[PDB]
């Protein structure tokens, strides 16, 4: 049950408690619901790599108090 | 007139980085040795000294770079992507090159609604700015943001530079307030920093690199425009399309 911080580029930080083996989709969707953002309009990043909704903290070797970077989706 | 990559497999998010790297004086000085950056600049110069032969030499090193990024970036050839994600992953492949870009700063925040304040030191190669103040300047690098304690909006968070690397890059979600790049030059602890290149975000789906040449003119490296580049008398991208800005220390 690790604690994760989801940090947006505006300086916002949202704390989340999550189990190591549950997929991050529930975290992502809840962050979008809290901030009023669209899943299609933002990207999540951990340790420089984009993270999918199927990813789990254990698969990405996340530790307690680690940080996920949220970006407005700007691809091309 | 310099050479550039041609568009293919939606690799504009990578071509724009490659053009910026090969025209960096500090990078060229450091690389000049089985480095991927040495291979990049050697193949580019080998191509720049000379149309299909040029494309093959440029495509080989681009492919090698893409394959190096693939595990970290988790993309498939032909996927769209962002240089904001790709640029630092490329730099982290070699610590001796990444050191040229790693600057130290601190995020300074102070809410006016409640008392919440913090000052957190970080070390990054590419920081993102959104909703910058109209007076935004590298020496006054502030933007509007919410407060995590009371949810008040339009508070200000400020980047306080502490140690600037020879190359200094920033990403702007909505661009810069204006596009006269001379006003964003700055000294920091005795060293001059000038904008030498800019990555433009066009139509929210395409990246193009602009290079400052010695005579003060500019070079547009739009990979759609074939192997050659285009010379412009002065800078031209709309301010809201200024995506990544590259400062380089002047020697
Ligand atoms: Ca240059
Ligand atoms: Cl130059
Ligand atoms: Zn507050």
Residue numbers in the entry:
A (entry chain B): 16 to 91
B (entry chain A): 225 to 256, 262 to 279, 301 to 501
Question: What's written in the study?
Answer:
Ub/Ubl protein conjugation can be reversed by specialized isopeptidases termed deubiquitinases (DUBs) or Ubl proteases, which antagonize Ub/Ubl-mediated post-translational modifications. Moreover, we focused on recently structurally characterized USPL1, which is the only deSUMOylase with a USP fold but for which its mechanism for SUMO paralogue specificity had remained unclear. USPL1 featured an approximately 25-fold higher activity for SUMO2 over SUMO1, which suggests a much more pronounced paralogue specificity as previously assumed from fluorogenic reagents. We structurally and biochemically explain this substrate selection, as USPL1 uses the USP fingers subdomain to contact the Gly27/Gly26 loop of SUMO2/3 to discriminate against SUMO1.
Taking inspiration from Ubiquitin- and ISG15-processing USP-substrate complexes, we semisynthetically obtained SUMO activity-based probes that contain a reactive warhead at the protein’s C-terminus. SUMO2 and SUMO3 feature identical Ubl folds and differ only in their unstructured N-terminal extensions. We prepared a SUMO3–2Br probe with a 2-bromoethyl warhead as well as a ΔN-SUMO2/3-PA probe equipped with a propargylamine warhead. Both probes reacted covalently with USPL1 as evident from a shift in molecular weight and led to pronounced protein stabilization as assessed by protein melting temperature analysis, indicative of the specific recognition of SUMO by USPL1. We solved crystal structures of USPL1 in covalent complex with ΔN-SUMO2/3-PA to 2.4 Å resolution, as well as of USPL1 in complex with SUMO3–2Br to 2.17 Å resolution in a different crystal form. The latter structure featured two almost identical copies in the asymmetric unit and was used for single-wavelength anomalous dispersion measurements with a selenomethionine-containing SUMO3–2Br probe. Alignment of the catalytic triad Cys236, His456, and Asp472 in the SUMO3–2Br probe-bound structure was observed, and the importance of the respective residues for enzymatic activity as well as probe reactivity was confirmed by mutation. Alignment of three independently obtained relative arrangements of the USPL1 and SUMO folds revealed near-identical positioning of SUMO in these highly conserved areas including the SUMO C-terminus, the Pro66 loop, as well as the Gly27 loop in the fingers. Strikingly, mutation of Gly27 into serine abolished USPL1 activity completely, in line with Gly27’s central structural role in anchoring of the SUMO fold into the USPL1 fingers.
